[PDB]
Design a protein around this ligand. Structure first.
Ligand SMILES: NC(=O)C1=CN([C@@H]2O[C@H](COP(=O)(O)OP(=O)(O)OC[C@H]3O[C@@H](n4cnc5c(N)ncnc54)[C@H](OP(=O)(O)O)[C@@H]3O)[C@@H](O)[C@H]2O)C=CC1
Ligand SMILES: CCCCCCCCCCCC(=O)OC[C@H](COP(=O)(O)OCC[N+](C)(C)C)OC(=O)CCCCCCCCCCC
Ligand SMILES: [Zn+2]
Lengths: 124, 88, 115, 145, 359, 233
């Protein structure tokens, strides 16, 4: 509605639609970066006059497929090891210190972790 | 130094007059590069955001060895220039 | 090996006077081929126009002083003669050679963008 | 040795049945294959610190000019000891017995240009060895001996 | 052209858009405009389109022939030249070429009616739909091209419809629209000259006795370019013509004499005296039998009418351009059709022209 | 009449621990460096007047002469039976703007007889001519034209010197250091002129310069000496 489409936000107040061709992505309306040019603005160009908007490339936004994934938990330890969760075809191994009391994402995958005790506190 | 070598280098007329070359020192050697254009040095292409340019000397840097060697070159080509003395 | 038409050995001339006479003959060589340059390249300008432009070319740079830089200017002008007489440059390059070309006040340059 | 080889020792499409015997009667050379690869074997399963450093020890760059050149004949060598110091005057006044050991080798004999590989020695070969063209063809085959 | 066409880097259109030009005027520069050149695939369009694209203006060229639009894309950079398939009977396709356009140029104009369009339907029906549709999309500037002898009350169909084309636009686009009247332009493959070079020109005496004020097509190509970047030239009427007056029969013998074309003109068909009814009958017969646009009945009348300069309009010098004469350019444009080539210079055309007039 | 094998089913060796030797490659040039040093000294012996200096890098021998002494040394290196360098493989150059004679004209020679190569290196300025080696080798008739075209070096005595690698009517000599890598002009087609026309350079995307994040530290030092002891003080 000419307000969120051209503004960057953490989430979307409205429920997105897969069939709206003015959204930034099928699964998200507002862009996920301050410098990212809104899709509604870009499609208002000379070269989209006769080109069909339906067939244009609209990959699903990354910043949503991660937040659907439930947060991983660690039991009786304060170091989280993540190396892509795929074997030797992943990101370099990183160790995540769990001293802080919230969900700390991985360096590359974006996966979030926790401890055994703070499982009830972080989920709040 | 007295030689009008610009008639044999084939460089365009604009290098002799409308361009300024800086002789600086980044830590043991000296370099020469041309100061940027007033306008048209970098304009954002309206298609894909490419950093367009009309200055053809933007990517050129000459690595010298000694200061007087660089000054000899600039006078030889008939180049306007100024020298930036590094801070001690 | 057999050198091509209108070739000269590249020689470092060590006389001021000899270079003067070499140039003078060269300028006549361009004027002798004035009719050919029109017919070879199908130029839109008549024969008198080419001589006028050739004269504007020769008049332009007659005041050079350095002999070491005299030979270089005579060497490359020989190549220009050899390339043109042997019909090596394409038609477009000669047409654009003669088709090249007062300034404006500071307000005029300030408004549009200057340089 | 690359002598003639039968058709059935080459990984290629062959002839099955009486057509093999037809082929061996018509074809000029019966031990040549059709060239089509063996579908049953060819590409059947598809593909689916100092102790170890030398760059820092690269040979140095040393230039020998007329000044240092003269010093080898007069002072000698760092193995067998014996400004602008011009060589031309030194060659004008110096012992030829210095020349016949330092400036020249093997009793003044000129030094043949150093071979980039000494062991490049050739011998002429014959038809029965290399299996190439007979003698009338206008080439000859050389080997490393 | 020179190095940069825009007078000022920032130009505000009549619609409030603030366009900033970038670059030093090269192929990779831009001007921030979007000039829809209707009928760009024609003779005049290929000059209007070429100048606009090289200086960085986006050009939207609506076409009906698919194989003729390919060569227009060379002039511009990537994305500079755009294409829209359309027909004047498809209103929706018209609105595709004006939605993003800040400049709209009209060049559509015919002399021969076909089995799908009449002379009015194109010089008016196309123009009326194009002009009115452009206004509804907030187009800042409209530029129009009509005949050089527009007259609402003329008995010639071309001149009558072209004149009404001026009225119907100004009742549709409004006061902002501009009208430019070009004299017969001469250029490579110019329809004005292609009739003079044709060897078998039946009724050559009758057709070529008409008078004209020939104008160089490049200048008219720049004439629209000068008008395009300026808002000061709205609501005007411009007639563009050349100083020195020439007639077709004066040109036809002047043209032939350069090509050196004894017995041959009398035999090959250069001079074909034919009766006036036969010319009228021949044009009518081909109008139902031909398949390519031939000589029309309308051009039989136009041959009796001479070109008229209208004093209410404005000349080239109003735009700061001095028109060029046919003498300085007539030779080169027929040089394709011509021991030692004789180049007929600017002054020597008169000496040729002298030789034609001498009996 | 026997079935062909299947190579995938053949038995294969099994290899475990690897001991890849790591020793200085310069050891295999120990004699080669020794042989070449004498030969360069020999040439200076046979040419005290012209051989300014020389140096040997591994199995390569370099001879440095003035432009005046070029043809003299090359004639000696061609005809003298101790050094029969009959074929001139390469005639190259490079630009070093700091020095007064920025250019460095090279001459790689090949001796099929004695199986060795030599490198005559004579400096040149933007104006100082270099004698042509055509009277010795006709094979440099095209190697010099490339050097002139890409550098502007004036070759004295060339039977026919002109452009060989650049466009007709090209302005400037490209392989210089002050010549921009993108050039000064580029061409396109202009429909109104009906010809392909030169035009000033315009880049939609400028050549990004990534040399700024280069090394600020030292990378390589002196190295290890390998000079044969017979060529030391
Ligand atoms: N020197 C000259 O040529 C003359 C100029 N004029 C007038 O100037 C104007 C410019 O025309 P010009 O380019 O010179 O000559 P053209 O006849 O070649 O221009 C015709 C242009 O308009 C298009 N056109 C014509 N009819 C239709 C139609 N029903 N539907 C869609 N498009 C149509 C054509 O499309 P397409 O070609 O793709 O089929 C073409 O793009 C004309 O009105 C002309 O009469 C006046 C006298 C002579
Ligand atoms: C060989 C005969 C050529 C017949 C042409 C024709 O039939 O043309 C007749 C008319 C004319 O239309 P046009 O030729 O497009 O008019 C434009 C060209 N002018 C301006 C020169 C006239 O069209 C029709 O009714 C076409 C019906 C199709 C008939 C089958 C073919
Ligand atoms: Zn991870």
């Amino acid at each position: 509605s000419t307000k969120e489409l051209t503004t960057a936000r953490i989430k979307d107040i409205s429920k997105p639609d897969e069939n709206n061709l003015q959204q930034q992505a099928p699964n998200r309306i507002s862009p996920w970066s301050k410098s990212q040019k809104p899709r509604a603005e870009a499609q208002d160009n000379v070269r989209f006059a006769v080109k069909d908007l339906a067939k244009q490339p609209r990959p699903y936004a990354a910043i949503d497929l991660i937040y659907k994934q439930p947060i991983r938990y660690i039991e009786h330890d304060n170091v989280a090891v993540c190396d892509g969760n795929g074997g030797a075809q992943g990101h370099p191994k990183v160790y995540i210190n769990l001293d802080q009391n919230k969900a700390i994402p991985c360096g590359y995958c974006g996966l979030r972790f926790a401890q055994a005790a703070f499982k009830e506190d972080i989920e709040s | 130094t007295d030689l009008a070598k610009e008639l044999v280098s084939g460089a365009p007329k604009e290098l002799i007059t409308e361009r300024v070359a800086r002789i600086y020192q980044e830590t043991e050697t000296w370099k020469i590069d041309w100061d940027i254009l007033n306008k048209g040095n970098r304009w954002e292409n309206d298609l894909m955001g490419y950093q367009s340019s009309s200055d053809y000397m933007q990517g050129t840097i000459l690595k010298f060895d000694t200061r007087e060697g660089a000054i000899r070159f600039a006078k030889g080509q008939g180049w306007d220039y100024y020298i930036q003395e590094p801070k001690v | 090996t057999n050198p091509t038409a209108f070739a000269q050995t590249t020689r470092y001339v060590k006389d001021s006077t000899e270079m003067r006479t070499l140039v003078l003959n060269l300028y006549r060589r361009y004027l002798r081929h004035s009719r050919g340059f029109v017919n070879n390249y199908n130029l839109d300008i008549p024969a008198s126009q080419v001589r006028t432009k050739i004269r504007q070319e020769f008049e332009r740079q007659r005041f050079v002083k350095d002999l070491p830089l005299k030979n270089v200017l005579y060497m490359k002008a020989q190549m220009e003669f050899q390339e043109l007489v042997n019909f090596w440059k394409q038609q477009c390059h000669v047409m654009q050679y003669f088709e090249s070309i007062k300034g404006d006040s500071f307000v005029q340059k300030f408004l549009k963008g200057a340089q | 040795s690359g002598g003639p080889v039968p058709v059935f020792k080459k990984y290629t499409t062959g002839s099955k049945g009486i057509w093999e015997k037809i082929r061996q009667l018509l074809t000029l050379v019966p031990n040549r294959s059709t060239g089509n690869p063996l579908v049953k074997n060819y590409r059947v399963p598809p593909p689916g610190y100092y102790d170890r450093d030398h760059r820092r020890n690269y040979p140095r760059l040393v230039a020998f000019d007329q000044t240092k050149v003269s010093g080898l004949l007069t002072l000698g060598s760092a193995q067998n000891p014996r400004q602008s110091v011009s060589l031309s005057s030194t060659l004008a006044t110096i012992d030829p017995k210095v020349v016949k050991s330092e400036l020249l080798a093997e009793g003044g004999s000129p030094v043949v240009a150093p071979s980039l590989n000494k062991k490049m020695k050739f011998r002429l070969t014959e038809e029965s060895e290399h299996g190439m063209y007979p003698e009338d063809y206008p080439i000859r085959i050389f080997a490393q001996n | 052209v020179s190095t940069f066409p825009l007078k000022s880097d920032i130009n505000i259109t009549k619609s409030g858009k603030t366009l900033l030009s970038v670059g030093q005027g090269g192929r990779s520069s831009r001007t921030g405009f979007t000039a829809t050149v209707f009928g760009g695939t024609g003779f005049l369009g290929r000059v209007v389109v070429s100048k606009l694209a090289k200086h960085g203006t986006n050009v939207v060229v609506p076409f009906r022939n698919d194989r003729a639009r390919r060569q227009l894309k060379v002039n511009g950079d990537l994305g500079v030249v755009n294409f829209v398939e359309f027909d004047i009977r498809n209103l929706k396709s018209i609105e595709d070429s004006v939605k993003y356009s800040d400049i709209v140029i009209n060049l559509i104009g015919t002399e021969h009616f076909s089995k799908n369009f009449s002379i009015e339907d194109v010089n008016i029906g196309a123009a009326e739909r194009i002009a009115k549709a452009a206004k509804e999309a907030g187009v800042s500037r409209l530029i129009h091209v009509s005949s050089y002898n527009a007259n609402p009350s003329s008995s010639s169909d071309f001149y009558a419809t072209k004149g009404i084309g001026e009225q119907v636009v100004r009742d549709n686009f409004g006061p902002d629209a501009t009208i430019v009247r070009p004299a017969p332009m001469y250029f490579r493959n110019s329809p004005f000259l292609n009739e003079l070079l044709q060897i078998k020109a039946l009724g050559g005496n009758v057709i070529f006795k008409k008078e004209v004020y020939p104008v160089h097509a490049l200048q008219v190509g720049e004439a629209i370019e000068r008008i395009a970047f300026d808002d000061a030239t709205a609501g005007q009427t411009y007639e563009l013509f050349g100083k020195e007056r020439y007639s077709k029969k004066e040109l036809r013998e002047m043209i032939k004499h350069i090509i050196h074309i004894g017995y041959y003109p009398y035999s090959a068909g250069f001079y074909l005296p034919a009766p006036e009814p036969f010319l009228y009958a021949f044009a009518l017969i081909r109008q139902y039998i031909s398949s390519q646009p031939r000589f029309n009945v309308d051009q039989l009348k136009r041959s009796h009418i001479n070109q008229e300069i209208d004093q209410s309009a404005k000349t080239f010098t109003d735009l700061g351009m001095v028109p060029d004469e046919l003498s300085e350019y007539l030779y080169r444009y027929v040089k394709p059709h011509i021991q030692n080539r004789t180049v007929y210079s600017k002054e020597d055309i008169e000496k040729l022209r002298d030789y034609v007039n001498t009996p | 009449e026997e079935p062909l094998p299947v190579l995938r089913d053949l038995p294969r060796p099994e290899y475990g621990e690897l001991h890849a030797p790591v020793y200085n490659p310069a050891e295999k040039y120990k004699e080669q460096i020794e042989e070449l040093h004498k030969f360069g000294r020999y040439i200076m012996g046979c040419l005290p007047k012209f051989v300014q200096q020389f140096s040997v890098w591994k199995d390569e021998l370099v001879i440095y002469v003035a432009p005046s002494a070029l043809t003299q040394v090359a004639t000696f290196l061609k005809d003298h039976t101790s050094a029969q360098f009959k074929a001139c493989m390469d005639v190259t150059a490079a630009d070093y703007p700091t020095r007064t004679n920025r250019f460095d004209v090279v001459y790689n020679l090949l001796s099929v007889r004695h199986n060795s190569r030599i490198r005559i290196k004579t400096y040149a300025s933007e104006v100082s001519p270099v004698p042509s080696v055509v009277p010795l080798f006709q094979g440099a008739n095209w190697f010099e034209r490339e050097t002139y075209d890409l550098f502007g070096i004036f070759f004295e005595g060339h039977p026919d010197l002109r452009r060989i690698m650049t466009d007709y009517g090209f302005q400037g000599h490209p392989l210089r250091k002050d010549f921009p890598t993108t050039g000064y002009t580029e061409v396109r087609y202009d429909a109104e002129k009906r010809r392909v026309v030169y035009e000033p350079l315009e880049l939609t995307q400028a050549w990004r310069n990534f040399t700024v994040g280069s090394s600020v530290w030292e990378q390589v030092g002196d190295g290890k000496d390998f000079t044969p002891e017979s060529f030391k003080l």
